Amino acid sequence: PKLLNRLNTYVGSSRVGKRFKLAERNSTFTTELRAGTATFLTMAYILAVNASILSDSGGTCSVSDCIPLCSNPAIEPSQCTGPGLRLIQPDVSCKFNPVNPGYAACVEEIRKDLIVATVAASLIGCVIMGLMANLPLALAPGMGTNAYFAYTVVGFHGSGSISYRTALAAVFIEGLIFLFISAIGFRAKLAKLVPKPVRISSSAGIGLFLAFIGLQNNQGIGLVGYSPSTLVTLAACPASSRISLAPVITSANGTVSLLAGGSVSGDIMCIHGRMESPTFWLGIVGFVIIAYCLVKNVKGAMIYGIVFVTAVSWFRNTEVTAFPNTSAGDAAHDYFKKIVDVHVIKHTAGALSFSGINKGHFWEALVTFLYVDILDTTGTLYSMARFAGFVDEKGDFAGQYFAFMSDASAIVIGSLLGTSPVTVFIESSTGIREGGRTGLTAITVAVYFLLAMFFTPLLASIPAWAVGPPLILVGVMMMKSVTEIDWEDMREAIPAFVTMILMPLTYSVAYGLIGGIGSYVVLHLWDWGEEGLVKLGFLK
Amino acid sequence: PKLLNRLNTYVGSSRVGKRFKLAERNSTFTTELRAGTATFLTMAYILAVNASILSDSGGTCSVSDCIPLCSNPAIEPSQCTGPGLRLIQPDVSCKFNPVNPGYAACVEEIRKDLIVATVAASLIGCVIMGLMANLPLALAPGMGTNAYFAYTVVGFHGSGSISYRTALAAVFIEGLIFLFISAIGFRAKLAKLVPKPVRISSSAGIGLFLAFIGLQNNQGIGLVGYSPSTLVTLAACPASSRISLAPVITSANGTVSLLAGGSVSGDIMCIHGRMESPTFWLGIVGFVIIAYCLVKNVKGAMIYGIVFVTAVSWFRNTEVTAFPNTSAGDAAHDYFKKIVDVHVIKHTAGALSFSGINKGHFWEALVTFLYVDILDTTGTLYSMARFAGFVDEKGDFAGQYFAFMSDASAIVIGSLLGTSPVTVFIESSTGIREGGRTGLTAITVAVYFLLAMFFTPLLASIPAWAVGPPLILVGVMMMKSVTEIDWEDMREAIPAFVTMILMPLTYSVAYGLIGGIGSYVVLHLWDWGEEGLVKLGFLK
Ligand SMILES: *[C@@H]1O[C@H](CO)[C@@H](O[C@@H]2O[C@H](CO)[C@@H](O)[C@H](O)[C@H]2NC(C)=O)[C@H](O)[C@H]1NC(C)=O
Ligand SMILES: *[C@@H]1O[C@H](CO)[C@@H](O[C@@H]2O[C@H](CO)[C@@H](O)[C@H](O)[C@H]2NC(C)=O)[C@H](O)[C@H]1NC(C)=O
Numbered sequence A, B: 001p002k003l004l005n006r007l008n009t010y011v012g013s014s015r016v017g018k019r020f021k022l023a024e025r026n027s028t029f030t031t032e033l034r035a036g037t038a039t040f041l042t043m044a045y046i047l048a049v050n051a052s053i054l055s056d057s058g059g060t061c062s063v064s065d066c067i068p069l070c071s072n073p074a075i076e077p078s079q080c081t082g083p084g085l086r087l088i089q090p091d092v093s094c095k096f097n098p099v100n101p102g103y104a105a106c107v108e109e110i111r112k113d114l115i116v117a118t119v120a121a122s123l124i125g126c127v128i129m130g131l132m133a134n135l136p137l138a139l140a141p142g143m144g145t146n147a148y149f150a151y152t153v154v155g156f157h158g159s160g161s162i163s164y165r166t167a168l169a170a171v172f173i174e175g176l177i178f179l180f181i182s183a184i185g186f187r188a189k190l191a192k193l194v195p196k197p198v199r200i201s202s203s204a205g206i207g208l209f210l211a212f213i214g215l216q217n218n219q220g221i222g223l224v225g226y227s228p229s230t231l232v233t234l235a236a237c238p239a240s241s242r243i244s245l246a247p248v249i250t251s252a253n254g255t256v257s258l259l260a261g262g263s264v265s266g267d268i269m270c271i272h273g274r275m276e277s278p279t280f281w282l283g284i285v286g287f288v289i290i291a292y293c294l295v296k297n298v299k300g301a302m303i304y305g306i307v308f309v310t311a312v313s314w315f316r317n318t319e320v321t322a323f324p325n326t327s328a329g330d331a332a333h334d335y336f337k338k339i340v341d342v343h344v345i346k347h348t349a350g351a352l353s354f355s356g357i358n359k360g361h362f363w364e365a366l367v368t369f370l371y372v373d374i375l376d377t378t379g380t381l382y383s384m385a386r387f388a389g390f391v392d393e394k395g396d397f398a399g400q401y402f403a404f405m406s407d408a409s410a411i412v413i414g415s416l417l418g419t420s421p422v423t424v425f426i427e428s429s430t431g432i433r434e435g436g437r438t439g440l441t442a443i444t445v446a447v448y449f450l451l452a453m454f455f456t457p458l459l460a461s462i463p464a465w466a467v468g469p470p471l472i473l474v475g476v477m478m479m480k481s482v483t484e485i486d487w488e489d490m491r492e493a494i495p496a497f498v499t500m501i502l503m504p505l506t507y508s509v510a511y512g513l514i515g516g517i518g519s520y521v522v523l524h525l526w527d528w529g530e531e532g533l534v535k536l537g538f539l540k
């Protein structure tokens, strides 16, 4: 008849085929492979974006890896011996602009480690879900939680209140708690605990947060910069026309002087040449490519746009080059020259630290991770169940228990590997839309992720303006939940608006959730008191 | 019969009552007075908010009103004569932190002028609408266009690309163009010119812009400040723990030095004491009051909240005082002591300047004003027509022609008086919901606005944390239009998301509109080309 049909029949009637319930679900082997391929194409952008975002966190190292610098840049430290010439001992400021070369070497090694960790965590989560849960779902580091972990919990180059190791410990304990509450069937009560407008608008707030990240400089395509009067205006001037800032002391005449120890910022203030950055326009071209691919229902839109922008930036002597003519750029290019490489995690693997448990910021981050994972994973898993036709009248889809246990275990494993919480991706719908019904789709995505390794050099050379439009369009996709908010009801609109707007402005998911929940509670205090009095009988 | 019934019958059967079509519309005199009172209570927040926002623009004066300052602050300029002691000639930096006392005196006088101008423009617009158009609509300076005029077209303290006089000329010409296109009936075609997603999402973008303004320091309650790494984090530390930023030059070793001529910012960076500013918490209390009042359908929610916050801030020796122990604070308190005052516009009246007509920024601001006014006024006027039951099968409500002419004339008059474009308020619905059907409602609102004069001292002493929650909640109400966007369609979602997110981030309504329209045009180039080829017959 046909070799493909022969393979399908052979696998469907084999022990593995019965194990995966191929016949019972009306798809045998090639449908599962095609669904896995479609899901991997849809979610391949994570391989670049997660690594970039988590590398921006600074990794595991501290000032300890900052090298001493000579008094004048013209003399290398080894030659820094002469009259009036001394080595400068690195301090905390070594981590920020101007970034110490040793800390840049950190960030590059940690980016390689985080690429490998992303791939390994996605592979392990996909395998666990495919085997123990037997569902066509793909697991990978959470896009939404990625930025919260990197820029809020830890902060850029470890400028947050919680260290990277302590944040990994927080993710580990959050995964353990999620596993426990899923096991005891106590997860739905917490899901119900959050107010409706807050849970509905948290996704839109996170989408705005990601889009704002994609419009920054060290994070995306630019187009948003610093303004002395408004704090944000139109960026996307060339990097040669961007300048940094330092705190100063004003007075009653006009004198202003530097503040010793001030935390200088990156090159965020445009002095001229607005809307002239070639990198911004390359990112805009990538944005247009991804937007057309999404509109045309082309699988792999984001990966195609990222690939185009990165390929354009791989040329060595252009204004959009990913390998500038510097020592760091030379090292990056040398690493990129080897197309394939088997990189071994040496820093982020098993880098947990339980020193910050007593700190309140640790618990804030832990609770934010836990509730984001609860709400997101519950919604996504049940949506996938509905899409695949596994939901029955009672609302359960058989493997839900093991599905949530697989998600929690994947979170724990990713935390051990050194990455933000790993969740089930909505992109799995593509595979489900392609006919994937068993766990073989997850195994196929895991095999594709395994192939994603051996390409760390290519994945480690992706610039910010390539991450860029992927972030902006992920925010666009996240925004679709706003339609479920009754904006005519202030008791629901005000908390929802606060949740949406505080995440990008305060720039923290936890602060947005706290503000939304607090506004909801405050606005419903009157109603709750009235209802309590009525129950007591004081009022009719 | 009740005296009210005699008055109603007498007025309804009189020449004025027949002129206003009282009997034909089933409301005679007391319904119109009640509707006007309700509309004025709903829209009274403008009297404070518009004046504050337009005063933040810096007004009409330049460095010419900055007084020379002595070398040391301990010596007043009149005593600035001695060895090594000299007077500093004011420059552009005199307008910004530290603000020159002369420019502060400007801003205060201009705030009084702009309070009077707001009241006069609202009164004139309401009278014109009530007489010429005979509709129960209230006209007042546009809340949405207020912030765009102050912080984007002109900029804080005249830091924008267009001067205040040139911006007034832009508003004047925009009003003239709006009047012309309304008269020749081409307004509908221009309204149809804008893409649907951009048109729908512009209101939400402006709402986010207003909320962001309300979450700033010199504009609202704080809670959003500067961050070296993220550009925005959690503010609301006490003013004593806020410091300014100045541009610096980095190097390859770590040296950083001030940049001569750098535009120093306000006290936006919190060094410690986050979430501890008493002014932020007073603004939060005002927000809570306005939020319950909106939830409880209490008319005048915003004015009640503003009044509470201002009354708390009117005490002289507190940390939330609107009159700090300074020369400027002493002058503000002295002015506030006289409860009533007949202030005469002396700076902003007739301050038009047509010098910047050749500049492209002038035309950008003009087009943004024109299209915001077109879309907003059309939508609001037609919504009010549907609500009042003046709409026929064809969609015309009789006085629409003169309604739009009245709106354009009010815009022109407000520009002459020195205020941003004046539009018909959605708060007029309250008056329509109360039974107002004729122009007597507009005349009643105009009389209330006239009474609003003689209270400039009370209205000029309203702090930023009082403006604050009004801005945030206006943004909340503006957000309700997002539900009309089909977020499942990327070809429609992406332009809408860009429009929503660019207005607060780039901090400009014009930039948001430009980005949204450009994304819409780019994403439809393929479809438009395909349709053109099909029409030509190349494709089936
Ligand atoms: C880092 O190198 C710079 C050279 O650009 C040093 O700059 C000194 O300080 C200012 C800025 O150039 C000048 O007034 C001095 O003349 C510079 N010195 C020299 C020798 O050029 C800067 O001092 C160096 N860092 C430190 C900590 O000394
Ligand atoms: C402005 O006033 C200050 C008073 O605080 C003057 O004092 C200067 O203060 C800075 C640091 O705050 C020192 O570095 C300067 O050496 C001080 N100057 C003197 C003369 O003592 C300051 O000089 C004044 N500036 C001007 C331009 O008049």
Ligand SMILES: c1ccc(CNc2ncnc3[nH]cnc23)cc1
Residues within 6 Å of the ligand: A141, A142, A143, A144, A145, A202, A203, A206, A372, A376, A380, A423, A424, A425, A426, A427, A478
């Ligand atoms: C709210 C919504 C989404 C998230 C991030 N997780 C997530 N969930 C589902 N699908 C994804 N693809 C990429 N990331 C995700 C967090 C909070």
Ligand SMILES: c1ccc(CNc2ncnc3[nH]cnc23)cc1
Residues within 6 Å of the ligand: B141, B142, B143, B144, B145, B202, B203, B206, B372, B376, B380, B423, B424, B425, B426, B427, B478
């Ligand atoms: C979009 C939406 C609204 C506006 C601002 N005008 C406006 N229109 C209607 N009602 C109001 N009350 C206060 N301002 C307004 C501009 C653009």
